[model samples]
Target chain A: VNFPNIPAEGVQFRLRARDTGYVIYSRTENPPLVWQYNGPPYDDQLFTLIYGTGPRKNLYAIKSVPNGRVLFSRTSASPYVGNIAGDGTYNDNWFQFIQDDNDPNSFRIYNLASDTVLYSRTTADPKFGNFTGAKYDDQLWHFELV
Target chain B: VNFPNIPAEGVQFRLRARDTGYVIYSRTENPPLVWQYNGPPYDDQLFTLIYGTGPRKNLYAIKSVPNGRVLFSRTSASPYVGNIAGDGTYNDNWFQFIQDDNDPNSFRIYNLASDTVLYSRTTADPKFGNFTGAKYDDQLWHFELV
Candidate 1:
């Protein structure tokens, strides 16, 4: 099965967790973390999926439009999901969107370096988590185009 | 003298402090305070001056492009310069761009509610300050259109 390709111009959208029905929001702080919120998905919750060129043509970088930070996963890091300063072709910054068979609109965001899937925890902030499987709703995400 | 009108389509620009030569930056946290930094002004530093319609057509809301938050001032608060979620015509959220006589390109961002001008502090983080006059360089700002 071939992975889907995002357009070169990029697609602007919002990510919502299946279980909590909360959209992911980016805060305006340094070393920002991806958190889940129940509010309307505005600019802070809006993101862009950029298709890479050259060697990383197949991968995508999830960029926070407000701060221009790209989502990255570091297994060694505590939260697992965090944002880097700017856009780049680094392995940790790249991700693959695997379509979920159950829901055509949902996908599993898989990180390139850590080989982990982005998930949302049930904390007060519903902080992001990264693990191997998509057995739970937390692991399934719906991408709503804006 | 009349305050120059900002187009309804809004103007995207960066605010640079005349004293520190640093642009304003927004962090990804709750009760986000506007800070000043010498780094290249990107999305976090870029803002849109949105002119109001109807009664407030003369006033403008300085919006953070990344988070969709509008700049506001609260004299009662520790940090006078802060951001509020979403856009509105609230007195606290509205500001007047008073052109500086010294520099045609510069302006004083005056808050309607507090009657204060946005300034940049010379601290480790260069936090934002709201004062009564443009007597110091910190109170004077240069708007760089992007």
Candidate 2:
């Protein structure tokens, strides 16, 4: 799967071209996005978003892409207090993807590129791609890719 | 019609791949960013940063590639907020390629070889490659190479 979440180098996780061997495209510490979400209740912090893709099937068993890192994360969920419609309403437009009834722990990640969720960790990893039964507790997450 | 909210569908919605050949990360519901919420409540459990900043993180949930859609649907996310103009990207000049292509949003299409934009939506039809930087918004009919 040529998942964009994967770096051009990570794709080397598999063979390419004509049985090309796998090699780290970027041998540097370059993951993608990052962020910190304090929210309306504004506690000032939350731990989330910055972990590279879930453990793959030993795609690179020996070597690993340590280049990835999480810069910030937040607990946008909770009593759902604060400004910007933080009154516990799913009308935020962004979280609309998730089926949030009242779960209070939305996780948003950023890859440092754009200011949106790169991997919204609410209701299972949205990156997993099925929105119908994402099996997640939180509704939305965010990220920024650098 | 731009649906205010996804109409409640009693029918089971099965996610399907778009008709366009553009790569859609079925597995990357999460954006590509190294994230974290390292703060007063810091725990290495938070993600890290690999690239961009938090602004991109703001749009994480909405971050999607604008595949080709004619009638309507935000189902197709686009890196460019406007419209899905060029897929392979040979044509970057479509006025509404990614958004509402009108007076304020439409861009111009030109013929580099002739040193001029050979056509305008009001004046003629488009053939061959993308309308040199042409806008592919609502007014324009999104068509594939048939």
Candidate 3:
């Protein structure tokens, strides 16, 4: 995989773009606020891939350690699908990092919330593309140490 | 940086290839004995990133935790440029993992010995490329959970 599984829980780190050094930041109230890698590393950039206790207990949630907000999407609904939730106890907000099928050293962020994938829109845009399923580099990411 | 620096030394773990699920392994004898990604998890597959007090103290050597060999590569002189060495104290045997400049979550294994880097010759071939300098998915690698 482009990245290793959470060797253990509570490991704090950040994700930087392959084309840009910007780290991901999300400090909004709730949904509609998709993730973006547009700034240098900071507290909001620090995330812990914690395993959930829901149906997919083994899956992870990119959660902000400080605020406890988890990366959330929608599986059954839409309109405001991609955003962070207050918690990850629900089944819809879980995720898993699977290695990109065709790309080496790249992983697609799988989200149960939307039953889709997290992908970069382009090398120039900082916005992420939400697709039901994508197994390519544009939808893949790697890790960075802060 | 394409990859993070070894957070610290003495971090014990094994690397399962992103695509092959192969962990790097080796037996007793040194040089010309290149490493391989074969079989399930075993002592031979375990490695620890240790730091040396040499000139490039910051750089790390992937040392076999069970035995005591370090990944080594030579720039010009080498019985086998892609093999491991018994000791990693010398400059030649010392190595460093540089994150890919253009890709995140990917790393280029730099060998001070060969003054070159490690690259898998082909996805189909188990043997690594003996080239002096190259950076591609074949040569790039990502970490995995033990």
Candidate 4:
């Protein structure tokens, strides 16, 4: 699922859950900031990250292509993807992408605010997201073009 | 410089001497059938061969691209690319192309008539071809597209 370098202006891509081939879809369920699963044609899974220019280009925004909402995290809080404002706040729009040094193509993403790690709650968990210090397989993900 | 799989019908390729990056140009010089170092625009360096199909595909013909003269071996005596017929005569048009099992991409081209091997006279000698029983770097060659 590793992608070529992220294009500067933003490119559409699908975020697939490793091993399972399930894609994270922007769910319309009860809770806020939840994700669902589906096979192909689940166009809601498309996301665009504007990988800004320059050395390492530290900031980028993962915005939903369907909802036009961007993913954001509050101070010491779990991150959520919704109709958040693009006011250039660190926690609201910035994300630090860290690539595994030994294997540059694999990466770990973190919220610029809390510094908590992002991962799926459990192997079988379907909705909520998990933020912790645990470095698990679910925390590791590569990219794929849409 | 990489060629596609040998075409089913026939194809032309330039046999480049790897060390000097110059191609083997067929020459009608003194000692008869000597090859020389030639740079670009000299299409004499081009050789056409109908790399027969299938397992091992042992049969092939190395002919001059410009003159259409097929290579000929004067019995088990010696070899030369001469004013021979492109006709499928045993000495003039038959050859054995065997892939080096230990080095899949490299090949050993043998003259069917003399049962001798094709090699650069010496390492970087850049002149006549040498027929030998020894298996050395000079005897091994990988093909390049025309």
Best by DockQ: 2
Misplaced by over 4 Å in model 2 are A1-7, A11-75, A78-146, B1-3, B11-135, B139-146
**Candidate 3 C-alpha lDDT tens digits along A1-146:** 22344435778877655543445655665643446657546676777777654233436777775567776655455533454566665555666565544555656666533446666655554356556632445665666554
Q: Score each candidate by Cα lDDT.
A: 0.67, 0.21, 0.57, 0.53
Tell me model 1's lDDT, rounded to 2 decimals.
0.67
Residue B132, model 3: Cα distance from true site in angstroms: 1.8
Clashing pairs in 1: A27-B28, A28-B27, A28-B28, A28-B29, A29-B27, A29-B28, A66-B66
- Per-residue CA lDDT of candidate 3, range B1-146, in tens? 21554545676777544444455665576634556556667787677776654233335677777777776665455545443556565555565565664565667665533436666433555365345433456566666545
DockQ values for all predictions?
0.01, 0.04, 0.02, 0.01
Worst-scoring 10-residue span by lDDT in model 1 chain B = B1-10
Candidate 2 residue B25 C-alpha distance from true site, Å: 27
Output the better candidate (3/4) by TM-score. 3
Clashes of each: 7, 111, 14, 1
TM-score of each: 0.45, 0.18, 0.43, 0.40
**Residue-wise C-alpha lDDT for candidate 2, range B49-141, written one tens digit per residue:** 111112212110111222221111111233221222222122221111121213332222221111122121222322212222322431222
Q: How big an interface RMSD has model 2?
A: 19.0
Question: In model 1 chain A, which range of ten residues has the least summed lDDT?
Answer: A1-10
lDDT of 4 by residue, A22-44 (tens): 56655444555446364565667
- TM (chain A), candidate 2: 0.17
User: For model 1, what is the alpha-carbon lDDT of residue A80?
Assistant: 72
lDDT, candidate 2, residue B68? 28
A10-31 in candidate 1: lDDT tens per residue? 6788887777787877656644
